[PDB]
């Protein structure tokens, strides 16, 4: 239930009608809310998880580091970003040898 | 990761062996296998033809492409040609990517 | 001697003129021809398509040919492309002779 914050670059920002070009205050922009995917997707501003750094032993304590980015694992499940009235309908998948899940 | 076309069922391996011809066996029978053979080798020719499928350039580009060329300047030898001792040598590796397409 | 394909009957000349429209004639008849006309010009589009016949390379050469390329090194402009002021310029004359044949 914390809406006070949003990801720096990870959200879509729309302008209101007659919104200025540059140095617009936060009230005139329209910030988009992605929270509908909380179920299948990790929070954008939080670590994916935690992993062990070392082998424990009688001498060595178990130490765990933070996973900032996690590329994929077989068995992952996610959802795509949501569609709006103001947002684009389609895109062009670049012509290339490979692409993974080419949803814009 | 190195390159080329990955295939679940690539073109099969062709294995070849020249069958053993043993030297003269001893007269009295022996249980052991024969370890004495005739020194031998074989020779022949292989023909390998592959049928390739091409994807032609459709480009609507205006200015000219980059191409692969033999540089014209004079040299003691010809590139991709035989030496004076009869040795064939490829001077440089030739990539496949010259023509361009839009991203 | 300059180049190209000599022909006894080359493709014919297309001549074009916009017909004269005279200004107001005087009321009383005059023998002289009318030297006063309306300033005028015309505009349109021309389509010219030529059908060319090609002779393909049959060469059995081993080593690679010389080809025509755009050199890759970076430059302020693109060759055979428009300028910053909108001016189209051809950097160098391009001959027709690169592929080789035996004499």
Distance between CA C79 and CA A11 in Å, rounded?
42
- CB-based contact B63 C69, cutoff 8 Å: no
Six-digit token string for B72: 């014209």
Distance between CA C42 and CA A94 in Å, rounded?
45
The answer for residues whose C-beta is within 8 angstroms of residue B91's C-beta and 6 or more apart is B79, B80
Side-chain half-sphere exposure of C8, counting CA atoms within 13 A:
0
- Burial letters for A9-35: b for 16+ Cβ neighbours within 10 Å, e otherwise? eeeeeeeeeeeeeeeeeeeeeeeeebe
Q: Does A17 touch chain B (CB under 8 A)?
A: no
Q: Does B55 touch chain A (CB under 8 A)?
A: no
Distance between CA C101 and CA C65 in Å, rounded?
11
Q: Tell which residue, A72, B95, A38, B24, has the closest CA to residue C72.
A: B95
Distance between CA C22 and CA C33 in Å, rounded?
10
The answer for residues whose C-beta is within 8 angstroms of residue A70's C-beta and 6 or more apart is A48, A49
Q: Residue A36 carries which DSSP code? A: G
Distance between CA C4 and CA C2 in Å, rounded?
7
Distance between CA C91 and CA C82 in Å, rounded?
11
Chain A interface, mutation test: which of B3, B4, B96, B103, most A Cβ atoms within 10 Å?
B103
> C and B: touch, per 3+ CB pairs < 8 A?
yes
What is the helix (H) or strand (E) element at residue A14, kind and residue range? strand A13-15
Long-range contacts of C9-13 (CB under 8 A, 24+ apart): none
Q: Does B82 touch chain C (CB under 8 A)?
A: no
- Burial letters for C63-97: b for 16+ Cβ neighbours within 10 Å, e otherwise? eeeeeeeeeeeeeeeeeeeeeeeeeeeeeeeeeee
3-state SS of chain B: helix, strand, coil percent to 5?
Answer: 0, 5, 95
Q: List, in sequence order, every residue forming a beta bridge with A13; answer none if it has no partner.
A: A31
Q: Does C5 touch chain B (CB under 8 A)?
A: no
Chains near B (3 or more Cβ pairs under 8 Å): A, C
Instruction: Select the residue of C66, C70, C80 nearest B70 (Cβ to Cβ).
Output: C66
Chains near A (3 or more Cβ pairs under 8 Å): B
Residue A52 burial (10 A CB sphere; 0-12, 13-18, 19+): exposed
For residue A92, what is the nearest residue in chain B, using CA coordinates?
B103
- Report the SS3 class of residue A37: helix
Give the phi and the psi of residue A13 in degrees, each rounded to 5: -120, 125
Distance between CA B81 and CA B86 in Å, rounded?
9
Instruction: Select the residue of C63, C66, C70 nearest B65 (Cβ to Cβ).
Output: C70
Six-digit token string for C97: 């002779």
Q: Tell which residue, A98, A93, A99, has the closest CA to residue B102.
A: A93
Please name the residue that has the structure tokens 């910030």: A31
Please name the residue that has the structure tokens 């090194």: C73
Contact residues on chain B for A96, CB-CB shorter than 8 A: 103
Q: Is A40:A77 a contact under the CB 8 Å cutoff?
A: yes
- CB-based contact C69 B70, cutoff 8 Å: no
Six-digit token string for B28: 């009295």
């Amino acid at each position: 239930g914390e809406d006070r914050f949003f990801p720096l670059s990870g959200s879509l920002i729309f302008g209101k009608q007659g919104t200025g070009r540059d140095n617009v205050d936060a009230d005139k922009v329209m910030i988009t809310n992605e929270e509908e995917i909380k179920t299948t997707n990790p929070v954008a501003t939080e670590s994916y998880g935690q992993v062990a750094t070392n082998h424990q032993s009688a001498q060595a304590q178990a130490q765990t580091g933070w996973v900032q980015n996690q590329g994929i694992l077989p068995g992952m499940v996610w959802q795509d970003r949501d569609v709006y009235l103001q947002g684009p309908i389609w895109a062009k998948i670049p012509h290339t040898d490979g692409n993974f899940h080419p949803s814009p | 990761l190195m390159g080329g076309f990955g295939m679940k069922h690539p073109p099969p391996q062709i294995l070849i062996k020249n069958t053993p011809v043993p030297a003269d066996p001893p007269t009295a029978f022996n249980k052991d296998k024969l370890n004495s053979f005739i020194t031998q080798y074989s020779t022949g020719q292989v023909s390998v033809e592959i049928e390739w499928e091409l994807q032609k350039e459709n480009s609507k580009r205006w200015n000219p492409e980059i191409q692969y060329t033999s540089n014209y300047y004079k040299s003691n030898n010809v590139e991709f040609a035989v030496n004076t001792e009869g040795v064939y040598s490829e001077p440089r590796p030739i990539g496949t990517r010259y023509l361009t397409r839009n991203l």
